Amino acid sequence: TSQVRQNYHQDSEAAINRQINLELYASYVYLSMSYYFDRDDVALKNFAKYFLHQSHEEREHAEKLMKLQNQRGGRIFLQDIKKPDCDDWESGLNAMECALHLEKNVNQSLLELHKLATDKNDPHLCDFIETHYLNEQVKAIKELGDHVTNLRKMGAPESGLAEYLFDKHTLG
Amino acid sequence: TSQVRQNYHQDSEAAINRQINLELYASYVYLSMSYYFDRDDVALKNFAKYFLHQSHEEREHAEKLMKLQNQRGGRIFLQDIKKPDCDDWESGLNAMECALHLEKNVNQSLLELHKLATDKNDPHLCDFIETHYLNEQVKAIKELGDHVTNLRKMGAPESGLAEYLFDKHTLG
Amino acid sequence: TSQVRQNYHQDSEAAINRQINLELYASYVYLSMSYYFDRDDVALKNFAKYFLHQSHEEREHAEKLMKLQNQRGGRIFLQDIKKPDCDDWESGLNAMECALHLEKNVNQSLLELHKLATDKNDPHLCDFIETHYLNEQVKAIKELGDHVTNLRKMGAPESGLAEYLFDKHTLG
Amino acid sequence: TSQVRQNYHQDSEAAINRQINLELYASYVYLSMSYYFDRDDVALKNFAKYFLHQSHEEREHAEKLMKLQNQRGGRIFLQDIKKPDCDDWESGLNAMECALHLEKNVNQSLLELHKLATDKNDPHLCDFIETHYLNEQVKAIKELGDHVTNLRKMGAPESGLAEYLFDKHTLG
Ligand SMILES: CCCCn1cc[n+](C)c1
Ligand SMILES: CCCCn1cc[n+](C)c1
Ligand SMILES: CCCCn1cc[n+](C)c1
Ligand SMILES: CCCCn1cc[n+](C)c1
Ligand SMILES: [Au+]
Ligand SMILES: [Au+]
Ligand SMILES: [Au+]
Ligand SMILES: [Au+]
Ligand SMILES: [Au+]
Ligand SMILES: [Au+]
Ligand SMILES: [Au+]
Ligand SMILES: [Au+]
Ligand SMILES: [Au+]
Ligand SMILES: [Au+]
Ligand SMILES: [Au+]
Ligand SMILES: [Au+]
Ligand SMILES: [Au+]
Ligand SMILES: [Au+]
Ligand SMILES: [Au+]
Ligand SMILES: [Au+]
């Protein structure tokens, strides 16, 4: 037992490890998306930059979870990072919809983690999740919903002009 | 009777109170409009900012009227601020048309107030209305008419691209 | 159903709309108070400034709640803003006591909202209320209690000198 | 007839000369008041400064009227400046009340002048009076009413402490 461990349940430790893996997977998905839009036959530079930024942010979230694991005296156990389900994301609108789905999945995982922490009476872990993750997820989901709405209204994905102008004016 | 009151008719005092209520109502309408465009399924940020600015300006106008009431020795009597007639404003173009209607209604109220002040031989009140309200209303009405004209020409509300580009280039 | 909505109960949405209306009502009450002290027969400028600042702060709180409603995929429904119960607030001390009562009422509403959010297992909403509203209310209530205590000790409301000096030294 | 005169009625010219005399008289009254509070047995320096400032402002108003008279091609005819009715103003509160009376008298004269200008269809003169005199009078009357209210509430004129503290905190 760690000399620092106090009020840290084994279930919480396992759930934190699972969340670390999920965040790394999300970072990988965003990396794939970013370099899809860097292809010469897609060529939407600002979409690529947006998704690369999201990938790096996901990596930061995973690293913060690992730091938390060590702070509380838990032990990090890493697992395979599965490859993204898709190789070709087919458009800016489709990529935004996939990102919205992914962010809502991550949010659901975080909500389950918070429920577990509440059940184990771990106020520090609950506060950590609330302060560093829940509002970030809400903001990300709202932003992605806004992007999807605007792309749909502009006529994407059929109108390539819509995605070009969205890339220039919203993501630029 | 107030120690400062001079050449201030009771009818003018009542009309000023009515105008205060009308300005507060206009502020409320603009607030509703602003947060309609903040919805995830509307998502026109610059429309939202424009209407929030208009809401705050209307509040400032109401406060200036209250200051005038106290300056002349009248007594402020506040009333319920009625909720806006609409919950869903349905588009940028429709919201601009509604704002044009509202601003013309406020202008008509101000013109009636000026007529009352003229009939009561209250040059200070006439000058107050002329200096602080009439040209502001004319400018606001002209600007809203310009916005409506441009949105109609661009193809709004059917073309969501038109409203997106108007949001970026005119209101941005 | 909104594309962004997740773990947001209908009861929470309704309670948020009620809280929006309550905050707007509080802003209206503070506006009335502020322009009572601007009267020529009251003439306590710093009381007026204090209550005007409180009114604007209440408006900001209402707008933050509306932003939250949109973030979570709820839909804002506005209602009439009822006029303040009083037209004449009768003194600085009486106005401070009324403000204390109002702030405690708003705090009770926020506590009920937090209880509802806890019952619906909405950690994001609980954290929102805790972070942005609860401590602000505690601080406001403490400040108003301090003001009431000092005004009472100085001999208000009977001693107009007490209210004049409190206006100059505490609120100035 | 002056080479510049146009749409300037003789009645308006005479009324302007009367207003010049009234403004000079008001300046004289304020000068008397100012040096009453400079007496060693009164000794309220900030009251003296306040009334000296008012005296100089009245002189400026008279000079602006003379400039207007020359601009429109009228001819200035000066008259005796009568001495103030009082040599001893008896207190700060009494002086403020006398100043309020004087400012309301000047305002009534200006309103009669504006009525005359309106009857003679002299829009330039009406605008001159509105822009440079009417709101200044309203503000001065409101300020003097505020001062009287505060001095009365503090316990003046019986409480010399009230006038001392008003001199320090309001007029200082
Ligand atoms: C597997 C998640 C699919 C999300 N989604 C919805 C619509 N689109 C184009 C993608
Ligand atoms: C009640 C005021 C209606 C104004 N108006 C005109 C056209 N549109 C779309 C709105
Ligand atoms: C209706 C709330 C009344 C609060 N209250 C208490 C004492 N005073 C002067 C006011
Ligand atoms: C001749 C004008 C008198 C004005 N007045 C009213 C009360 N006090 C003390 C002075
Ligand atoms: Au796939
Ligand atoms: Au896919
Ligand atoms: Au997907
Ligand atoms: Au997808
Ligand atoms: Au409607
Ligand atoms: Au409507
Ligand atoms: Au409308
Ligand atoms: Au409309
Ligand atoms: Au009441
Ligand atoms: Au009350
Ligand atoms: Au009350
Ligand atoms: Au009260
Ligand atoms: Au006298
Ligand atoms: Au006198
Ligand atoms: Au007098
Ligand atoms: Au007097």
Numbering used by the authors:
A (entry chain B), B (entry chain A), C (entry chain K), D (entry chain O): 9 to 180
Task: List passages from the publication reporting this PDB structure.
A typical example is provided by mammalian ferritin, which possesses an essentially spherical architecture deriving from the self‐assembly of 24 protein protomers. The resulting structure, which is extremely stable over a wide range of temperatures and pHs, has an external diameter of about 12‐nm and an 8‐nm internal cavity. In nature, cytoplasmic ferritins are heteropolymers resulting from the combination of two types of protomers: the H chain (heavy chain, 21 kDa) and the L chain (light chain, 20 kDa), in ratios that depend on their tissue/organ localization or health status. Recombinant ferritins can be produced in vitro as homopolymers (fully H or fully L in composition). The former (HuHf, hereafter) targets human cells through transferrin receptor 1 (TfR1), which is expressed in high levels in several malignancies; the latter (HuLf) has been proposed to target Scavenger Receptor Class A member 5 receptor (Scara5), although this interaction remains less defined and characterized.
Au(NHC)Cl is a cytotoxic gold(I) carbene complex with a 1‐butyl‐3‐methyl‐imidazole‐2‐ylidene moiety as the NHC ligand (where NHC stands for N‐hetetocyclic carbene), coordinated to the gold center by a direct gold‐carbon bond; the second gold ligand is a chloride. The adduct between Au(NHC)Cl and HuHf was studied by cryo‐EM measurements, resulting in a high‐resolution 3D density map at 1.51 Å. The octahedral symmetry of HuHf was preserved also in the adduct and each protomer closely maintained the backbone conformation observed in previous X‐ray and cryo‐EM structures of apo ferritin. The cryo‐EM structure shows a novel tetranuclear gold(I) cluster, located in a surface pocket of each subunit where it is bound to Cys90 and Cys102. The pocket in which the Au(NHC)+ fragment lies is quite shallow; it is defined by the space between helices A and C, and the BC loop. The structure clearly shows that the two sulfur atoms of the Cys90 and Cys102 side chains coordinate to two gold(I) ions each, at a distance of 2.2–2.3 Å, with the exception of the distance between the Sγ of Cys102 and the second gold(I) ion (Au2), which was 2.5 Å. The coordination distance between C(2) of the carbene ring and the first gold(I) ion (Au1) was 2.1 Å. The gold(I) ions formed a zig‐zag chain, with the distance between two consecutive gold(I) ions being 3.1–3.2 Å. We hypothesize that these short inter‐metallic distances can be explained by the occurrence of significant aurophilic interactions. As mentioned, the observed density allows only one carbene to be confidently positioned, although the ESI‐MS data suggest that each gold(I) ion binds one carbene moiety.
